[PDB]
Short mmCIF file of C-alpha atoms and ligand atoms in Angstrom, two decimals:
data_model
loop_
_atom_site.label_atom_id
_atom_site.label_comp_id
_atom_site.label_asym_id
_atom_site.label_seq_id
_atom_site.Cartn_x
_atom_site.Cartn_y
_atom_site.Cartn_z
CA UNK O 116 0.00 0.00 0.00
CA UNK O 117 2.80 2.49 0.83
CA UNK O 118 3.60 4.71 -2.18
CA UNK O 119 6.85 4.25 -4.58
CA UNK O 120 8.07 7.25 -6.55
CA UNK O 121 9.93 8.11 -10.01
CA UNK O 122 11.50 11.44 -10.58
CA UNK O 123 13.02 13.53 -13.37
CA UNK O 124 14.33 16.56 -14.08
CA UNK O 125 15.57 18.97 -17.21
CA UNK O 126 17.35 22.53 -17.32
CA UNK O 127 19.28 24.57 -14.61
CA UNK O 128 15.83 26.07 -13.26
CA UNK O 129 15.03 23.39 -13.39
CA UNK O 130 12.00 21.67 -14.30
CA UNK O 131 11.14 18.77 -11.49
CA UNK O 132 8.48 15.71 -12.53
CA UNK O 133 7.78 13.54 -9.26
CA UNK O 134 5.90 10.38 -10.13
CA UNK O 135 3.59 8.45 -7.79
CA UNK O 136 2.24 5.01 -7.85
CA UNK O 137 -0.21 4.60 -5.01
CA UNK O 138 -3.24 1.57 -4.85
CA UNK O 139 -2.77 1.09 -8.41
CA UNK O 140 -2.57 4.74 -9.32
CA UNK O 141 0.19 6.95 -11.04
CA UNK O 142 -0.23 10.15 -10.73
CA UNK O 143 2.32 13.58 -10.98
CA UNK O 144 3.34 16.50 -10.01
CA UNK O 145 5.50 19.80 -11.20
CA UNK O 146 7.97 22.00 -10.25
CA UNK O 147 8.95 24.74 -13.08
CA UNK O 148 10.82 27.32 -10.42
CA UNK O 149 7.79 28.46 -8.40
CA UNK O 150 5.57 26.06 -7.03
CA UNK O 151 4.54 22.94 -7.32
CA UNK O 152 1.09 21.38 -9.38
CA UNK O 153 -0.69 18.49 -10.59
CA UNK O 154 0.47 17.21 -13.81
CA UNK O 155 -1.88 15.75 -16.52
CA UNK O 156 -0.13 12.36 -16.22
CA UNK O 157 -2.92 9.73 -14.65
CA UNK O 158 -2.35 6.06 -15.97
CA UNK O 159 -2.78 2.70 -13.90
CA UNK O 160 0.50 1.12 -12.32
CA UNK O 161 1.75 -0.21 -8.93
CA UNK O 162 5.75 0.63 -10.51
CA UNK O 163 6.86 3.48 -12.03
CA UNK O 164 10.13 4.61 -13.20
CA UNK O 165 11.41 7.60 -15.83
CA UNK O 166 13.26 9.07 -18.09
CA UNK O 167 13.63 12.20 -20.08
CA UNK O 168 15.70 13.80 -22.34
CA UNK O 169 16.10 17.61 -24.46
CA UNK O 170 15.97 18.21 -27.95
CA UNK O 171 16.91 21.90 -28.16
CA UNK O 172 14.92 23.09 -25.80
CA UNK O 173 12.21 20.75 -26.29
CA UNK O 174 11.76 17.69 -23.41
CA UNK O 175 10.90 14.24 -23.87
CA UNK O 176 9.89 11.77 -21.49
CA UNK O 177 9.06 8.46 -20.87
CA UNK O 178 7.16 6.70 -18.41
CA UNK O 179 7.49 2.74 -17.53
CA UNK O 180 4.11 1.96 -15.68
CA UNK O 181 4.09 -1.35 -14.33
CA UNK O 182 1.24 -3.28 -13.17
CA UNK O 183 1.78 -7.19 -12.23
CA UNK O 184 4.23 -7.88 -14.78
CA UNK O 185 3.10 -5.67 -17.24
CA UNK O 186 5.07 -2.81 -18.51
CA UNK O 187 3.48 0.05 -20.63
CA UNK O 188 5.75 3.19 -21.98
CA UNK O 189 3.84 6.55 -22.13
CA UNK O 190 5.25 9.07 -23.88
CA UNK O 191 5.09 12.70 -23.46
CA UNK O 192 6.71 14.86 -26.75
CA UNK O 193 4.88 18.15 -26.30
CA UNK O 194 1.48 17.67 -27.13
CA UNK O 195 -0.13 15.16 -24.47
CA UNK O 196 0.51 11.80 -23.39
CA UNK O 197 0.78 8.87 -25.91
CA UNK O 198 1.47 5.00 -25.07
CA UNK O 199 4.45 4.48 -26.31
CA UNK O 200 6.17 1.33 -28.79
CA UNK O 201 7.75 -0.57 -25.64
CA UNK O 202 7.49 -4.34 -25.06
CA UNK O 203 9.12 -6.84 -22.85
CA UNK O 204 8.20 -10.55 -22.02
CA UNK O 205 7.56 -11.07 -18.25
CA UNK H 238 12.46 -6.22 4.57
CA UNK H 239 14.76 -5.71 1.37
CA UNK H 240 16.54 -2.88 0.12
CA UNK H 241 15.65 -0.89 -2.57
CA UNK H 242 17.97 1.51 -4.36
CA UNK H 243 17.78 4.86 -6.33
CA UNK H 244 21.05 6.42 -8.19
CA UNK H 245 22.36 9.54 -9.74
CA UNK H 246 25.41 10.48 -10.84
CA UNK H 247 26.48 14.26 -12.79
CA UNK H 248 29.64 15.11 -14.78
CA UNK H 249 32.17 13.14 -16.41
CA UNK H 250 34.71 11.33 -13.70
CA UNK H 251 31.50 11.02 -12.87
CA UNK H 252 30.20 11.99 -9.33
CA UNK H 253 27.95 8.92 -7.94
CA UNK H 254 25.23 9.12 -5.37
CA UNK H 255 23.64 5.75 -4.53
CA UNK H 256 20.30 5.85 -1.98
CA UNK H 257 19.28 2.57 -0.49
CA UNK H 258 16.50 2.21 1.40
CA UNK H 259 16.59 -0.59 4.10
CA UNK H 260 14.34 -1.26 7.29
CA UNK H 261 12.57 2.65 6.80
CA UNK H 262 16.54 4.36 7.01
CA UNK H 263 17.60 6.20 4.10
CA UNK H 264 21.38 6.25 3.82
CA UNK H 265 23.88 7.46 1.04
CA UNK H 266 26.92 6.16 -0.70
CA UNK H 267 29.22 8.33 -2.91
CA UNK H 268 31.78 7.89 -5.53
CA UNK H 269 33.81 10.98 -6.21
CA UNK H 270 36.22 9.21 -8.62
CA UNK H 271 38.36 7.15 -6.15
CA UNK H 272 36.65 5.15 -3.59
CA UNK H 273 33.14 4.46 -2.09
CA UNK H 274 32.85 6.94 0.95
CA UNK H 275 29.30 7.55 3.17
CA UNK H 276 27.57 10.54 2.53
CA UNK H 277 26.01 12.80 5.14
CA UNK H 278 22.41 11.80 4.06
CA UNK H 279 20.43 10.56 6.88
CA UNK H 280 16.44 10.79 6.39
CA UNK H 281 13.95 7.82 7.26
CA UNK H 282 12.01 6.26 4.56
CA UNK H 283 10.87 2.87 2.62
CA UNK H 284 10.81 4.22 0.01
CA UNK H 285 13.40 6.45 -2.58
CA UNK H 286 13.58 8.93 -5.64
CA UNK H 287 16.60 11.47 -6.63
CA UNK H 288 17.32 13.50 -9.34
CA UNK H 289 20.05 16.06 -9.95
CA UNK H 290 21.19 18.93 -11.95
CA UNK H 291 24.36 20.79 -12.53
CA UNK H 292 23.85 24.75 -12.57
CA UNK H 293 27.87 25.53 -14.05
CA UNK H 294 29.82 23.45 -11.57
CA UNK H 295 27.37 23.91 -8.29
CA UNK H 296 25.52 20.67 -7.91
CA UNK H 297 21.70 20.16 -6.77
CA UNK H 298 20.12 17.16 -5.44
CA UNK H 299 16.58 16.44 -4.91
CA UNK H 300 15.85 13.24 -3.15
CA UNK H 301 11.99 12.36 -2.42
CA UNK H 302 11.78 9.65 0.69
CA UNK H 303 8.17 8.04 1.28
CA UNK H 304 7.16 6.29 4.15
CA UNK H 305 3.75 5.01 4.12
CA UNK H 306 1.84 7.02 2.03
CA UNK H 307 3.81 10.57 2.78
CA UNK H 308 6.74 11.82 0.06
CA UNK H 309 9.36 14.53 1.94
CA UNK H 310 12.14 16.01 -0.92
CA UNK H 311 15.09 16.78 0.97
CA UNK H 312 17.65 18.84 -1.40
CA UNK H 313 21.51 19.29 -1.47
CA UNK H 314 22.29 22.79 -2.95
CA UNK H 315 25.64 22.78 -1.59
CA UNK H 316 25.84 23.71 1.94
CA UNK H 317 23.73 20.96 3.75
CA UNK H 318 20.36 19.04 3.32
CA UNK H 319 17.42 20.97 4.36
CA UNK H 320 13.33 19.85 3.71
CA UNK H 321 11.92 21.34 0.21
CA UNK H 322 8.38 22.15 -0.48
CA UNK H 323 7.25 19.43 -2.54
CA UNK H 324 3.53 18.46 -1.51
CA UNK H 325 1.43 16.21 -2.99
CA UNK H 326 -2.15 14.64 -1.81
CA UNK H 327 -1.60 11.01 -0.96
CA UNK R 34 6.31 -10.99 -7.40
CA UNK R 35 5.09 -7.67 -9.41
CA UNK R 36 8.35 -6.83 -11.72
CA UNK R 37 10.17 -3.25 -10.84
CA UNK R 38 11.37 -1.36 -13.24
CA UNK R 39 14.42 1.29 -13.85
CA UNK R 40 15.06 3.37 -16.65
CA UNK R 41 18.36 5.49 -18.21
CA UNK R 42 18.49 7.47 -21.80
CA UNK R 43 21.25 9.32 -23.40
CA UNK R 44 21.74 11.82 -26.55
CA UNK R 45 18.67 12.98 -28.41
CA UNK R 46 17.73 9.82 -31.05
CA UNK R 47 17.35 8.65 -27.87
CA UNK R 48 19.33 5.72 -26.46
CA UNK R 49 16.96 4.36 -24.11
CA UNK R 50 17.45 1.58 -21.13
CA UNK R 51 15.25 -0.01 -19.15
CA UNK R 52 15.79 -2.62 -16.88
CA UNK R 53 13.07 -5.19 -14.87
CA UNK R 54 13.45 -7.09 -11.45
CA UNK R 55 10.94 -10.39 -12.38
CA UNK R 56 11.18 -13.08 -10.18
CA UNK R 57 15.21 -12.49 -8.85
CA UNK R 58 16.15 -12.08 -12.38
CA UNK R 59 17.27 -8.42 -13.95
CA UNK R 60 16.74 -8.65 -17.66
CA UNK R 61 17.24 -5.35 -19.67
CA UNK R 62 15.43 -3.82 -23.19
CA UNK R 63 17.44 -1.06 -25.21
CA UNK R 64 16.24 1.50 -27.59
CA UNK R 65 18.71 3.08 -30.08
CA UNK R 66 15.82 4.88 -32.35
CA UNK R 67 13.99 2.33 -34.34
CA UNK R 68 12.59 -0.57 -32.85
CA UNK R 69 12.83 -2.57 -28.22
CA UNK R 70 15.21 -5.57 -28.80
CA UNK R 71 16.74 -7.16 -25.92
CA UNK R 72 20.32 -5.87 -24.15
CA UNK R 73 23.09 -7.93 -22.76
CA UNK R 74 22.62 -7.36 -19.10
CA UNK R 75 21.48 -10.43 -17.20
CA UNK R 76 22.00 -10.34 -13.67
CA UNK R 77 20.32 -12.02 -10.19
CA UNK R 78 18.34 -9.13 -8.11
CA UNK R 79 14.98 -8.18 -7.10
CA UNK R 80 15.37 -4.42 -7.04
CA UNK R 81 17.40 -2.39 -9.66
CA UNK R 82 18.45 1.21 -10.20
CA UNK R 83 20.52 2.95 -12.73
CA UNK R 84 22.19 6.00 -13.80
CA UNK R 85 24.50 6.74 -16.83
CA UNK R 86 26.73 9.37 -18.21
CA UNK R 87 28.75 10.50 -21.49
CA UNK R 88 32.37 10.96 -21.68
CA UNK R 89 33.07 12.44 -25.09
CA UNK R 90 30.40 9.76 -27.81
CA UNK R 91 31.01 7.22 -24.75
CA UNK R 92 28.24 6.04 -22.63
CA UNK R 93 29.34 4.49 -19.48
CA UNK R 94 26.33 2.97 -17.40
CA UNK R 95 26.18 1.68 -13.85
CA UNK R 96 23.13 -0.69 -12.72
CA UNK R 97 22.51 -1.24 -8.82
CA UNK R 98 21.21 -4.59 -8.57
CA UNK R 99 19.96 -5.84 -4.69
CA UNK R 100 19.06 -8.99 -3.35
CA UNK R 101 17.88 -9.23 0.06
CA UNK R 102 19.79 -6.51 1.74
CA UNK R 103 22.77 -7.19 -0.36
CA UNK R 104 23.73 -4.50 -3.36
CA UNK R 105 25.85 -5.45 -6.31
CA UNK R 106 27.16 -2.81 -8.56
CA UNK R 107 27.29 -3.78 -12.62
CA UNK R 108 29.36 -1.69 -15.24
CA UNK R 109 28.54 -1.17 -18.83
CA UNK R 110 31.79 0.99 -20.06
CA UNK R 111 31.67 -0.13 -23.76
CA UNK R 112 33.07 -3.54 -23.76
CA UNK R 113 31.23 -5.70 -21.88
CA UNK R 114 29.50 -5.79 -18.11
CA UNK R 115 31.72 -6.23 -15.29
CA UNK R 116 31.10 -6.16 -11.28
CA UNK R 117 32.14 -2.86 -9.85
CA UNK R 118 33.61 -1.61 -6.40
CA UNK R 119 30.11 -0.57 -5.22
CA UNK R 120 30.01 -1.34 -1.15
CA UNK R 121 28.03 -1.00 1.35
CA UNK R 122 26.90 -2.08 4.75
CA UNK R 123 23.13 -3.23 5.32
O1 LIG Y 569 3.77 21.91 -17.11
C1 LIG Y 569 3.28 20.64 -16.68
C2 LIG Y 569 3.32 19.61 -17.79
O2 LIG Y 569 2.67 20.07 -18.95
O3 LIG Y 569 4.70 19.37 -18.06
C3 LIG Y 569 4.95 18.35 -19.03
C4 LIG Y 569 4.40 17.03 -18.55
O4 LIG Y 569 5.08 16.70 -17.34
C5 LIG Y 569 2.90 17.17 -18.29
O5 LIG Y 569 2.37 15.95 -17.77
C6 LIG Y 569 2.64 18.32 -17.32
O6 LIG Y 569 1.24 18.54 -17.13
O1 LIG Y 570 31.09 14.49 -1.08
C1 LIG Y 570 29.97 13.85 -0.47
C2 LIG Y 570 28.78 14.79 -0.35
O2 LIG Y 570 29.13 15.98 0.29
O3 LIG Y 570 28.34 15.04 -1.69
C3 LIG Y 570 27.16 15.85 -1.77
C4 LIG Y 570 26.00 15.14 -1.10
O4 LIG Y 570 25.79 13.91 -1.79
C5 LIG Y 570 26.36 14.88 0.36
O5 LIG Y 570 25.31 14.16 1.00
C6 LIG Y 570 27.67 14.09 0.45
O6 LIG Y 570 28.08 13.91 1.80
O1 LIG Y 571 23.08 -1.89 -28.03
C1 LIG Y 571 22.68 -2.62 -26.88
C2 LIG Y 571 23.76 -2.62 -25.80
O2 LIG Y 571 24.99 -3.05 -26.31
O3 LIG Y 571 23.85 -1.27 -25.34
C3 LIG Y 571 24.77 -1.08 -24.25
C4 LIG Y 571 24.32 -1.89 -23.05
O4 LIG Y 571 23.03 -1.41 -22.68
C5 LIG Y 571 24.25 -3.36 -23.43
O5 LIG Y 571 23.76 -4.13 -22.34
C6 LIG Y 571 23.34 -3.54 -24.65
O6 LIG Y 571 23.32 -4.90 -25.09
#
């Protein structure tokens, strides 16, 4: 029951993401400098971890949700959250 | 009852920071280039996150320690850990 | 028995890493820009972290694999992974 986190970050600011899987639920939240706030990142895992990465000045991340032995990638390129092209066989 | 781990590591020699988790202590482990040393990070928690960033040479840590359902960031910016403001609604 | 995961990218194709605890076994699937296939890192653990770095075109990685309260260090530095000096006392 007890929460596990992910977290990321980009820039000197910088920009913070701090994922949370609680009961089944991963959820975010956002630091750009001044105060923190609910991301738009809701998807269904007991496991998270990230990464991200810049193009320019443009991030990219990626989110492994887990659930049993499941793993789904969701992407995030700039324009809302996509499930991404990852597989694995567990 | 078994550990779990979260890493970072900035630069090139590189600098390593290793977090483990292990019976609700949260303890540190750091490479500088030559040799494993402890760190001065002492929080409790079941649970760890980190990310860093370099701003020029200064380096900033952000670790987020859960126990139960309740995330504290604790952050390094270069003279001592002290609590940060992250919140969320768990 | 629910796999954990861990995740590391690099550059801006990306290169992308991720790495799953199932079962006591650490199995990892890469990304180098087009198309999952399965990595060379096979190692005993049921909780994994990870962090990488550049020197120059060079990736160097380091995975933290645990078992029990026991953490084993792995080392990717372009030829190969081999145990590192990680230590520590839990
Ligand atoms: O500014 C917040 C935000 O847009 O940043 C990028 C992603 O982390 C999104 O989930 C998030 O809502
Ligand atoms: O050189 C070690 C050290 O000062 O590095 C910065 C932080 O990781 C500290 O907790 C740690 O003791
Ligand atoms: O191209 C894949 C690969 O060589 O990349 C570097 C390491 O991640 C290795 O485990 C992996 O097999």
């Amino acid at each position: 029951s007890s929460v596990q986190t992910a977290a990321t970050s980009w820039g000197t600011v910088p920009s913070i993401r701090v994922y949370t899987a609680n009961n089944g639920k991963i959820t975010e939240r956002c630091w750009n400098g001044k105060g923190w706030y609910t991301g738009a990142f809701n998807e269904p895992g007991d496991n998270v971890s990230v990464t991200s990465w810049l193009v320019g000045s443009a991030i990219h991340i990626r989110v492994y949700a887990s659930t049993g032995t499941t793993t789904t990638e969701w992407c995030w390129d700039g324009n809302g959250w996509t499930k991404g092209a990852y597989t694995a066989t567990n």
